[PDB]
Structure formats: structure tokens, C-alpha cells
Design an enzyme around this catalytic site. Structure first.
Site, PDB file in Angstrom:
ATOM      1  CB  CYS B 105      -0.918   0.025   1.223  1.00 30.34           C
ATOM      2  SG  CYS B 105      -1.980   1.520   1.262  1.00 30.34           S
ATOM      3  NE  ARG B 108       2.433   0.757   3.579  1.00 25.52           N
ATOM      4  CZ  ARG B 108       3.584   0.104   3.705  1.00 25.52           C
ATOM      5  NH1 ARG B 108       3.904  -0.446   4.873  1.00 25.52           N
ATOM      6  NH2 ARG B 108       4.416   0.008   2.675  1.00 25.52           N
ATOM      7  CD1 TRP B 277      -7.371   8.986  -2.069  1.00 33.93           C
ATOM      8  CD2 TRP B 277      -8.396   9.107  -0.082  1.00 33.93           C
ATOM      9  NE1 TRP B 277      -6.497   9.570  -1.181  1.00 33.93           N
ATOM     10  CE2 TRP B 277      -7.107   9.656   0.045  1.00 33.93           C
ATOM     11  CE3 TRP B 277      -9.233   9.079   1.038  1.00 33.93           C
ATOM     12  CZ2 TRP B 277      -6.632  10.171   1.248  1.00 33.93           C
ATOM     13  CZ3 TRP B 277      -8.753   9.586   2.241  1.00 33.93           C
ATOM     14  CH2 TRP B 277      -7.469  10.128   2.332  1.00 33.93           C
ATOM     15  CD  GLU B 282      -5.429   2.213  -6.883  1.00 38.96           C
ATOM     16  OE1 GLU B 282      -5.869   1.097  -6.531  1.00 38.96           O
ATOM     17  OE2 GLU B 282      -5.562   3.256  -6.202  1.00 38.96           O
TER      18      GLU B 282
HETATM   19  C1  HEM Z   1      -6.623   6.379   1.750  1.00 37.33           C
HETATM   20  C2  HEM Z   1      -6.147   6.285   0.500  1.00 37.33           C
HETATM   21  C3  HEM Z   1      -5.435   5.015  -0.038  1.00 37.33           C
HETATM   22  C4  HEM Z   1      -4.674   4.998  -1.141  1.00 37.33           C
HETATM   23  C5  HEM Z   1      -4.341   6.194  -2.067  1.00 37.33           C
HETATM   24  C6  HEM Z   1      -4.182   3.649  -1.331  1.00 37.33           C
HETATM   25  C7  HEM Z   1      -3.373   3.250  -2.381  1.00 37.33           C
HETATM   26  C8  HEM Z   1      -3.137   1.931  -2.696  1.00 37.33           C
HETATM   27  C9  HEM Z   1      -2.669   1.417  -3.965  1.00 37.33           C
HETATM   28  C10 HEM Z   1      -2.357   2.254  -5.227  1.00 37.33           C
HETATM   29  C11 HEM Z   1      -2.554   0.089  -3.847  1.00 37.33           C
HETATM   30  C12 HEM Z   1      -2.123  -0.871  -4.975  1.00 37.33           C
HETATM   31  C13 HEM Z   1      -3.428  -1.569  -5.359  1.00 37.33           C
HETATM   32  C14 HEM Z   1      -3.369  -2.230  -6.705  1.00 37.33           C
HETATM   33  O1  HEM Z   1      -2.426  -1.941  -7.477  1.00 37.33           O
HETATM   34  O2  HEM Z   1      -4.282  -3.039  -7.008  1.00 37.33           O
HETATM   35  C15 HEM Z   1      -2.960  -0.290  -2.501  1.00 37.33           C
HETATM   36  C16 HEM Z   1      -2.973  -1.563  -1.972  1.00 37.33           C
HETATM   37  C17 HEM Z   1      -3.374  -1.947  -0.710  1.00 37.33           C
HETATM   38  N1  HEM Z   1      -3.946  -1.127   0.265  1.00 37.33           N
HETATM   39 FE1  HEM Z   1      -3.973   0.919   0.146  1.00 37.33          FE
HETATM   40  N2  HEM Z   1      -4.684   2.848  -0.317  1.00 37.33           N
HETATM   41  C18 HEM Z   1      -5.468   3.656   0.504  1.00 37.33           C
HETATM   42  C19 HEM Z   1      -6.158   3.221   1.627  1.00 37.33           C
HETATM   43  C20 HEM Z   1      -6.071   1.971   2.215  1.00 37.33           C
HETATM   44  C21 HEM Z   1      -6.781   1.530   3.407  1.00 37.33           C
HETATM   45  C22 HEM Z   1      -7.808   2.396   4.199  1.00 37.33           C
HETATM   46  C23 HEM Z   1      -6.406   0.254   3.658  1.00 37.33           C
HETATM   47  C24 HEM Z   1      -6.824  -0.708   4.802  1.00 37.33           C
HETATM   48  C25 HEM Z   1      -7.390  -0.296   5.953  1.00 37.33           C
HETATM   49  C26 HEM Z   1      -5.441  -0.135   2.644  1.00 37.33           C
HETATM   50  C27 HEM Z   1      -4.819  -1.363   2.573  1.00 37.33           C
HETATM   51  C28 HEM Z   1      -4.238  -1.858   1.421  1.00 37.33           C
HETATM   52  C29 HEM Z   1      -3.849  -3.234   1.224  1.00 37.33           C
HETATM   53  C30 HEM Z   1      -3.975  -4.407   2.220  1.00 37.33           C
HETATM   54  C31 HEM Z   1      -3.263  -3.296  -0.180  1.00 37.33           C
HETATM   55  C32 HEM Z   1      -2.724  -4.565  -0.887  1.00 37.33           C
HETATM   56  C33 HEM Z   1      -3.884  -5.136  -1.700  1.00 37.33           C
HETATM   57  C34 HEM Z   1      -3.435  -6.362  -2.447  1.00 37.33           C
HETATM   58  O3  HEM Z   1      -2.424  -7.006  -2.042  1.00 37.33           O
HETATM   59  O4  HEM Z   1      -4.115  -6.680  -3.450  1.00 37.33           O
HETATM   60  N3  HEM Z   1      -5.264   0.923   1.776  1.00 37.33           N
HETATM   61  N4  HEM Z   1      -3.304   0.866  -1.824  1.00 37.33           N
HETATM   62  C1  LIG Z   2      -8.224   0.125  -0.077  1.00 36.48           C
HETATM   63  C2  LIG Z   2      -7.702   0.389  -1.465  1.00 36.48           C
HETATM   64  C3  LIG Z   2      -7.338   1.682  -1.846  1.00 36.48           C
HETATM   65  C4  LIG Z   2      -6.864   1.879  -3.144  1.00 36.48           C
HETATM   66  N1  LIG Z   2      -6.482   3.097  -3.593  1.00 36.48           N
HETATM   67  N2  LIG Z   2      -6.774   0.856  -4.003  1.00 36.48           N
HETATM   68  C5  LIG Z   2      -7.116  -0.398  -3.666  1.00 36.48           C
HETATM   69  C6  LIG Z   2      -6.975  -1.469  -4.733  1.00 36.48           C
HETATM   70  O1  LIG Z   2      -6.908  -2.790  -4.200  1.00 36.48           O
HETATM   71  C7  LIG Z   2      -7.361  -3.727  -5.176  1.00 36.48           C
HETATM   72  C8  LIG Z   2      -6.642  -5.049  -4.963  1.00 36.48           C
HETATM   73  C9  LIG Z   2      -7.321  -6.148  -5.765  1.00 36.48           C
HETATM   74  C10 LIG Z   2      -6.193  -6.966  -6.372  1.00 36.48           C
HETATM   75  O2  LIG Z   2      -5.848  -8.016  -5.471  1.00 36.48           O
HETATM   76  C11 LIG Z   2      -4.597  -8.610  -5.814  1.00 36.48           C
HETATM   77  C12 LIG Z   2      -4.788  -9.407  -7.078  1.00 36.48           C
HETATM   78  C13 LIG Z   2      -5.836 -10.316  -7.178  1.00 36.48           C
HETATM   79  C14 LIG Z   2      -5.997 -11.037  -8.354  1.00 36.48           C
HETATM   80  C15 LIG Z   2      -7.121 -12.029  -8.497  1.00 36.48           C
HETATM   81  C16 LIG Z   2      -5.110 -10.838  -9.401  1.00 36.48           C
HETATM   82  C17 LIG Z   2      -4.076  -9.920  -9.257  1.00 36.48           C
HETATM   83  N3  LIG Z   2      -3.207  -9.722 -10.276  1.00 36.48           N
HETATM   84  N4  LIG Z   2      -3.932  -9.225  -8.108  1.00 36.48           N
HETATM   85  C18 LIG Z   2      -5.033  -5.993  -6.506  1.00 36.48           C
HETATM   86  N5  LIG Z   2      -5.303  -4.983  -5.497  1.00 36.48           N
HETATM   87  C19 LIG Z   2      -7.589  -0.659  -2.381  1.00 36.48           C
END
Ligand code: HEM
Ligand SMILES: Cc1cc(N)nc(COC[C@H]2C[C@H](OCc3cc(C)cc(N)n3)CN2)c1
Ligand code: HEM
Ligand SMILES: Cc1cc(N)nc(COC[C@H]2C[C@H](OCc3cc(C)cc(N)n3)CN2)c1
Ligand SMILES: C[C@H](O)[C@H](O)[C@H]1CNc2nc(N)[nH]c(=O)c2N1
Ligand SMILES: C[C@H](O)[C@H](O)[C@H]1CNc2nc(N)[nH]c(=O)c2N1
Ligand SMILES: [Gd]
Ligand SMILES: [Gd]
Ligand SMILES: [Zn+2]
EC number: 1.14.13.39
Lengths: 402, 401
Positions: B105, B108, B277, B282
Site C-alpha cells: 500500500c 499508508r 480513495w 489504478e
Molecule cells: C486512503 C487512501 C489510499 C490509497 C491512495 C491507497 C493506495 C493503494 C494502492 C495504489 C494500492 C495498490 C493496489 C493495486 O495496485 O491493485 C494499494 C494496496 C493496498 N492497500 Fe492501500 N490505499 C489507501 C487506503 C487503504 C486503506 C484504508 C487500507 C486498509 C485499511 C489499505 C490497505 C491496502 C492493502 C492491504 C493493499 C494490498 C492489496 C493487495 O495485495 O491486493 N489501503 N493501496
Molecule cells: C483500499 C484500497 C485503496 C486503493 N487506492 N486501491 C485499492 C486497490 O486494491 C485492489 C486489490 C485487488 C487486487 O488483489 C490482488 C490481485 C488479485 C488477483 C485475483 C489478481 C491480481 N493480479 N492481483 C489488486 N489490489 C484498495
């Protein structure tokens, strides 16, 4: 047992069985990954030599031949009598190509089988090193039709110091540190610039002054050699539709030639073995020109393009960087100097991965280095999982000799 | 302790926090697998103690009477029941720590600002839906997005889990065509078909919002329709390319992940959807331009009159940038919170600095933190990172079907 590797664009899956043959340890452990870090006797020599000789005989499909067995015995005998051994010319050629093939940070490896190998293992002085280096540059440059090449200087030997090229590349622009802390020229080269000056070079004061070479023969201090300007092919940069861009007075050189890495083949070490290919455009247009700690031209270009540099959300940085990359490609093509864009290069690397899966059951690759520094996810390699590991023959980092 | 360098500035730190890594990752000294997406009372008590100790240290009450009293409370509960319950304050701390600990993330810097909804009293899928709607309403806040998590009951023996089958609270349908292609979002073909199997009448558009499949313990999942007034969307337009709006592209305001497991002190919450948000890449780079997602890059390049017959014109790069411009422009115009990749990565660098002082390091996954366009134009590209697992944590988990 073997790492399962997925491509997320296509959904295809392979297993990297080659990784099980990894010959040296990397920096990661089960507790923490350090993949993103840049820089993390006779019995052993014999084991490495035998493994290499075995690689060689497999490669030419003569495993188990009388020639194969004779070579193993000869090497073992030579090591027993002299503490080391010498490569046959054909083995050196094979070894240099394998080291390239094995390089996890190189995206250009589709070309690995096409490498000109110059044997300079008879070199005796720094003057002669310079002759070999000038010939390499002339051959590799080839008036802009670039050809990949490596020149191999004598191996490390007990009782004798190493041959070394102090410069990190054969062509480097001077970096002159200023009083305010700023740098005129290339900030990456401040240290080597000062060393050249310490060793009797009269500096220039431009932004693109080509540095002399500091060449070190065994047990001698380095000696300074100036490259003939006619030998160093350069490309002035202009943009096809932004006419003022040419007025920035930017240029770059044709030949990327890395000269400070150690080549390891069969337990033997060659601390001087400069190699060259051709550029991928992002190396010049994105990294060399746009890194904040390099030429750092991004904001000035964006301002001349009349972009709104007051807020990040206009994406002025991205727009300006794209146009700088366009200028590099246009300029090299205009000057008829070989260059490859990051889309073409990454597509060819995907083909390489495919070729290597069939040939060896895997391919060591460093994702962070393979994915280009702009438009990452627009390239196929972004979506490809990779396994990083060390195979030998190899190119390795080594300490600077000063 | 690993030495960590920033190559833009030349500054050096040591990550002493990594020495506290609980769980093992996938790498070994023989090979690095960092680029891969998916690599008993006694054990529970050990994790519970570690968590309670962590919490009391965080509030400067280690070794206090309150600390020892809590440790005794947890030991007694596990001894009696085989499990234990978190105080609400501990639940809030644990959820924030799990976010703080998430190596992938980039957002953070915001970790200390998280609304935690306690839905541990939930009994039915119907009630689960009510909690989810309240989460969406709060988090969306008419476009002024607020980070939030809703925590449903913990896993327990001899009882099925609560699960949200959808990977996010808002997803667009993906419909398999006769030729094998997809209309809509190819990422969601499986969930779309499951929704259809469970009685959903499908649409036939490119941006049809999916219903929710909600699973109460030991029940088959139940279908719930999100009220359209609850799901805020942003039609995409471009500030200078007037034809862009006619493409009919859109995206939704709220990224709300709903398929991950929240682990705190050895307790497991298989349903705990969280939302923040969007960062604009993304939507603009991944969701719209990935070849296995909407794959609209070439359509846009056609409309921009770009030369698509040579790669060296950099037509792909130019089209991608303008799509990202359209996302940012469109969200700002609609007054919906969004952050560009330059602002987000700059804030992450600040976060790394805060964490070095606070904890002596920060687990971070370089491949996920560096944005998918203009990587080296962002400061994080030049920052070495150390990736490791700390708890509390968000974990991937198997799909419930
Ligand atoms: C507040 C604004 C936030 C922004 C701008 C942000 C940004 C991002 C981005 C760009 C990613 C990469 C996701 C992807 O490429 O699919 C990500 C992943 C992630 N975020 Fe954040 N996030 C935010 C809030 C949060 C919150 C509130 C949580 C949990 C309480 C969180 C937990 C996570 C987790 C666990 C991942 C990894 C997801 C995965 O492995 O698929 N994020 N975030
Ligand atoms: C909380 C939050 C904030 C923010 N700005 N963006 C997000 C996006 O999280 C979406 C999660 C869903 C996928 O999960 C991992 C994944 C799952 C699968 C099935 C394939 C893949 N390539 N990767 C990648 N990130 C989540
Ligand atoms: C023929 C065209 C070639 C292309 C397009 C190419 C491309 C690249 C690129 C883009 C990098 C990353 C460099 C950086 O970011 O600093 C790289 C690194 C590397 N290349 Fe290749 N290369 C080519 C030829 C060669 C040859 C001929 C050799 C050796 C015989 C070679 C061996 C290496 C090695 C060892 C690295 C890692 C350097 C380091 O770690 O600093 N490459 N190459
Ligand atoms: C053969 C070849 C072809 C091609 N297209 N490009 C190259 C570029 O290789 C340049 C290699 C040499 C530096 O590595 C040594 C180094 C030294 C220092 C002080 C920092 C750093 N990041 N890296 C960075 N990349 C080499
Ligand atoms: C910290 C990070 O490893 C470092 O900036 C790397 C990232 N990837 C790279 N990739 C290439 N090709 N060249 C580089 O110099 C770097 N630098
Ligand atoms: C193979 C590779 O790990 C995969 O494509 C990753 C790369 N980096 C990523 N980074 C983010 N933020 N999100 C992703 O989905 C991915 N995908
Ligand atoms: Gd013009
Ligand atoms: Gd037209
Ligand atoms: Zn690793």
C-alpha cells in the site's frame, strides 16, 4: 519443488527448474526480501571448472566424447601443477556469451548468441590495453550500425596485480562539482572526473566533455589515455516537432560500453573485460536526462512546452518525459545510430523468456531492472512474474581499484 | 540489519524493524521470488500475548496494572473458550496496524486516520448488507472520501465464516461472449457468472454494477442489489480532447476491498471490507489500459490520430498519459477525492521517514509501490525497500467457492 511462475496478462504458468542450479547465494531470506537493493581453493576452483567444462561440452552436443574427457583431465592436471588453468579460445567465447545470457538485469538478452569476442589475454601494458579498447570501440560502433562485443584482458593471477579499467564505461561525460554544491555535466561521474584531474588531466568546462580513460596494468599506477574524438560517435538531440529542443544543446553517445565489471568463467576471474551493446532509449531519455540526480532536464523542458508546472495533477512530468524519449529515438534514427525503444525491447525479452524455458527450463531475471522506468505496465514484462538467481558464467560487480 | 539506500539523495538507513518479522516470505538465499503476486491454544496465546504487549507499548502502558490485567483476562478466556474477544480499542488499534503493516500500500501516510465500524454482533446476511451500505455511505460521503473498515464476526471452530464473495464492494460485470471475448471488465467474469447462477438477471452493458453475494455462517450466499444512489460514479471526460467524453468511459468513486482476511492477535476476520480513495494510475493505467482489462489504449490512440504502426512513435505512452489526465480531471471536476501518482509517492516517502523514526523501518514491496507509468519520475523508484511480514495484517485467502 520448483517456483511456479505466472504471466498475468495471458494467464500462462511455468515452473523455473533452472533456479535449482543456482551457484551462489543472493541477499534474500525467508524473513525478508532484499530484491530491490542495487548492491547487496583448488577443490572449489576444480568444482567450478568441471561444471563449466561440462556446460561447454553439452552446449556443442559432445558430452561424454573423448574430447570432453580429455579436457576434464587436462584441467584437473593443470590446476594440480600450477594452481590455475587456461581457457581454450572456443571456451572463452562460449563463457562470455553464457555470462551475458545469465545476466538477470539485462533486458537485451534475446541477442545473447550474437557477441563478438576479442581475446586480449596476451596484453602486456596499459598502452596495449588502450589499443585493444580503441579497436573494440571502432568495431562495436561500426559507423552507427552497432555490433555487440566484449574484449577479454588477462585473468587474475597470483603474484601479479590485476588489469583494471578505472572508468565505469568507456564513454562517460565529465561531472565538475561547483562551489554551491551543484554539478556541471554528469553528476554520476564526479568521482572519476576528479581522479582523472588528480592524474594529470586538464579538465574542460562543458556539460558533455568526454572523459579520458584511466587504465591500470598489473602492479602499476593507472595511466591516462585520451580517446580520439573521431572514435567517439555522438548524437545531437532534437525533437521532430518541438523546434526549440535542439537549442538545449543536449547530446548523448552511441556506444554503451560497461568497463568496470568482473567476468567469471569456470572459477577464473577477468577483472577487465569491457562489453558493449546498443542503447534502449529509456536509458538515455528517462534515466540519464530526467533523473533528478543526473542531467535533471525535466522541468526546463516542461516549461518550454508551456505546461502547467504548478500542480502535479496536470501530469507535466509525464508529458515532458515522453517527449524527451521521443527526441532520443528520433535523433538516433536520424543519425543512423542503432537504438531500441522500450516496447520493442521488452517484447523481444518476452520471446527470450519463452526460448529459455524450452532450452534450460527457466531464466534468471530481476523484475525491478527489466521493467522500464516509464510506461511500465504498458510493457509485457510488467505482467510477468520473474525469479532472480545467480548462475555462472557471470558478470559481477567488483570494488573500485582506488 | 539490512542497509537501505536512497539513490537520488544518497541517504542511508538501517531497517531494524525487519528483525521482528513473524511470518516467512517466499524468498531464499538461492532465489528471490519478490515479484510473485501470490506465493492450538498455545499458539493462539503466544500471538495474543505478542499483540497485547504491542498494544500496551504503543500507548505507553507496558508493565502497568492495566497491561497485566489484560494479559490475565486473555489467558482466562482462551483457557475457558479456546478463543478470546478484543476490546473495541484493541480492534481499532489492530485494524490501523494491519493497514500500517501492508507492504503493497502506497497510501499508508493516512494509516492513523481510519474509521472502524464494529460489526462483530452481525447475525445474518441481511444485517451484513445493512452494515455494508452504511460503510459505503460513510466512506463515500458525497465524494469527500473517508477511509473506513467494517469488521464482521471472527472465525470460530464448529462454525462457518462470514464471507463477501465479491473481491470489491463495487465491481463492473464481465460477460463472456460467444467468440470467447468479454463485454465489460474481464477481471470479473467468474464473479459475474456466480451472480447469474444465484439468480441475478444480467445486463449487457460495459459498466453494469454487480450485486453483492453475501455469506452468513453455514448458509449459501444471498444476493443483494446495491441501491444505485449509493454507488457514486464518475463519467470520464478530457479537458481538451472533446471527443473523449463520447467514449462513455466511467469509473466508481470508492475502492473497497472485500475478499481479504484481517488477522489480529491470532484472531481471524475473514470478512472485513476496507476502503480508501483511488490513486489515478489504478484507474487510468491499470483498469482501463491493461490488455487483460478494458484494454482501451488503442481506441484512444486512434482518436488522437497517433501513428500506431511503429512502437517508436511512443503512441502507447502518449495515449496512456492522456487517459490518466482524463481520470484526474474528471474526478476533480466531479468533486470526488483522487490522488495522482506524483503526490502519492511523495507522501509515501514522508511515510518512510516517519516510520524510520517511529519503528526503525517500514515493510514495503517495491514492485507494488512504484507506479505503473513514469516509475523513475517518482521518488520511490530510487528508494531501496525491504519487504517482510508483520502482524496485525491483511492476508489473501482462498475464494469461498
Ligand atoms: C486512503 C487512501 C489510499 C490509497 C491512495 C491507497 C493506495 C493503494 C494502492 C495504489 C494500492 C495498490 C493496489 C493495486 O495496485 O491493485 C494499494 C494496496 C493496498 N492497500 Fe492501500 N490505499 C489507501 C487506503 C487503504 C486503506 C484504508 C487500507 C486498509 C485499511 C489499505 C490497505 C491496502 C492493502 C492491504 C493493499 C494490498 C492489496 C493487495 O495485495 O491486493 N489501503 N493501496
Ligand atoms: C483500499 C484500497 C485503496 C486503493 N487506492 N486501491 C485499492 C486497490 O486494491 C485492489 C486489490 C485487488 C487486487 O488483489 C490482488 C490481485 C488479485 C488477483 C485475483 C489478481 C491480481 N493480479 N492481483 C489488486 N489490489 C484498495
Ligand atoms: C545488444 C543490445 C543490448 C541492450 C538493448 C541491453 C539492454 C540493457 C539495459 C536496458 C540494461 C539496464 C542498464 C541500466 O539500467 O543501467 C542492461 C544491463 C546489463 N546488460 Fe544488457 N543490453 C545489451 C547488450 C548487452 C551485452 C552485449 C552484454 C554483455 C556481453 C550485456 C550485459 C549486461 C549486464 C551484465 C547488465 C547489468 C549491468 C548492471 O548491473 O549495472 N548487455 N542491458
Ligand atoms: C552493455 C550495456 C547495454 C546497454 N543498453 N546498457 C548498458 C548500461 O549499463 C550501465 C550499468 C552500469 C551501472 O552499474 C554500476 C553502478 C554504479 C553506481 C555508482 C550506481 C549504480 N546504480 N550503478 C548502472 N547500469 C550496458
Ligand atoms: C532502488 C532501485 O532498486 C533502483 O532505483 C533501481 C530500480 N530499477 C532499475 N532498473 C534499471 N534498469 N536500472 C536501474 O538503475 C534501476 N535502479
Ligand atoms: C508480476 C508482477 O508482480 C505483477 O504484474 C504486479 C507488479 N506490480 C504491481 N503493482 C501494483 N500496485 N499492483 C499490481 O497489480 C501489480 N502487479
Ligand atoms: Gd512545433
Ligand atoms: Gd478525424
Ligand atoms: Zn527476494
Amino acid at each position: 519443488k520448483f517456483p511456479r511462475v505466472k504471466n498475468w496478462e495471458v494467464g500462462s504458468i511455468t515452473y523455473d527448474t533452472l533456479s535449482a542450479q543456482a551457484q551462489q547465494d543472493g541477499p534474500c531470506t525467508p524473513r525478508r526480501c532484499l530484491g530491490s537493493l542495487v548492491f547487496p581453493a583448488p577443490e572449489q576452483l576444480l568444482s567450478q571448472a568441471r561444471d563449466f567444462i561440462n556446460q561447454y561440452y553439452s552446449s556443442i552436443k559432445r558430452s561424454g566424447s573423448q574430447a570432453h574427457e580429455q579436457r576434464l583431465q587436462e584441467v584437473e592436471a593443470e590446476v594440480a601443477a600450477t594452481g590455475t588453468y587456461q581457457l581454450r579460445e572456443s571456451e572463452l567465447v562460449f563463457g562470455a556469451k553464457q555470462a551475458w545470457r545469465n545476466a538477470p538485469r539485462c533486458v537485451g538478452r534475446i541477442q545473447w548468441g550474437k557477441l563478438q569476442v576479442f581475446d586480449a589475454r596476451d596484453c602486456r601494458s596499459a598502452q596495449e590495453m588502450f589499443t585493444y579498447i580503441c579497436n573494440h570501440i571502432k568495431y562495436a560502433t561500426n559507423r552507427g550500425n552497432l555490433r555487440s562485443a566484449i574484449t577479454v584482458f588477462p585473468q587474475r593471477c597470483p603474484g601479479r596485480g590485476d588489469f583494471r579499467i578505472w572508468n565505469s564505461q568507456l564513454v562517460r561525460y565529465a561531472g565538475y562539482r561547483q562551489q554551491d554544491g551543484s554539478v556541471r555535466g554528469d553528476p554520476a561521474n564526479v568521482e572519476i572526473t576528479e581522479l582523472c584531474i588528480q592524474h594529470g588531466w586538464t579538465p574542460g568546462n562543458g556539460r558533455f566533455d568526454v572523459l579520458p580513460l584511466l587504465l591500470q596494468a598489473p602492479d602499476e599506477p593507472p595511466e591516462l589515455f585520451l580517446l580520439p574524438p573521431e572514435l567517439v560517435l555522438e548524437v545531437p538531440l532534437e525533437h521532430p516537432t518541438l523546434e526549440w529542443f535542439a537549442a538545449l544543446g543536449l547530446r548523448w553517445y552511441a556506444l554503451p560500453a560497461v568497463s568496470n565489471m568482473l567476468l567469471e568463467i569456470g572459477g577464473l576471474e577477468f577483472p577487465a573485460a569491457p562489453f558493449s551493446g546498443w542503447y534502449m532509449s529509456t536509458e538515455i531519455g528517462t534515466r540519464n536526462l530526467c533523473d533528478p540526480h543526473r542531467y535533471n532536464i525535466l522541468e526546463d523542458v516542461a516549461v518550454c512546452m508551456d505546461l502547467d508546472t504548478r500542480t502535479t495533477s496536470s501530469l507535466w512530468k509525464d508529458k515532458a518525459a515522453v517527449e524527451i524519449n521521443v527526441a532520443v529515438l528520433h535523433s538516433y534514427q536520424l543519425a543512423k545510430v542503432t537504438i531500441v525503444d522500450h516496447h520493442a525491447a521488452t517484447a523481444s525479452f518476452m520471446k527470450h523468456l519463452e526460448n529459455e524455458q524450452k532450452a534450460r527450463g527457466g531464466c534468471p531475471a530481476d523484475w525491478a531492472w527489466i521493467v522500464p522506468p516509464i510506461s511500465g505496465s504498458l510493457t509485457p514484462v510488467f505482467h510477468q512474474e520473474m525469479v532472480n538467481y545467480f548462475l555462472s558464467p557471470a558478470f559481477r560487480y567488483q570494488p573500485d581499484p582506488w
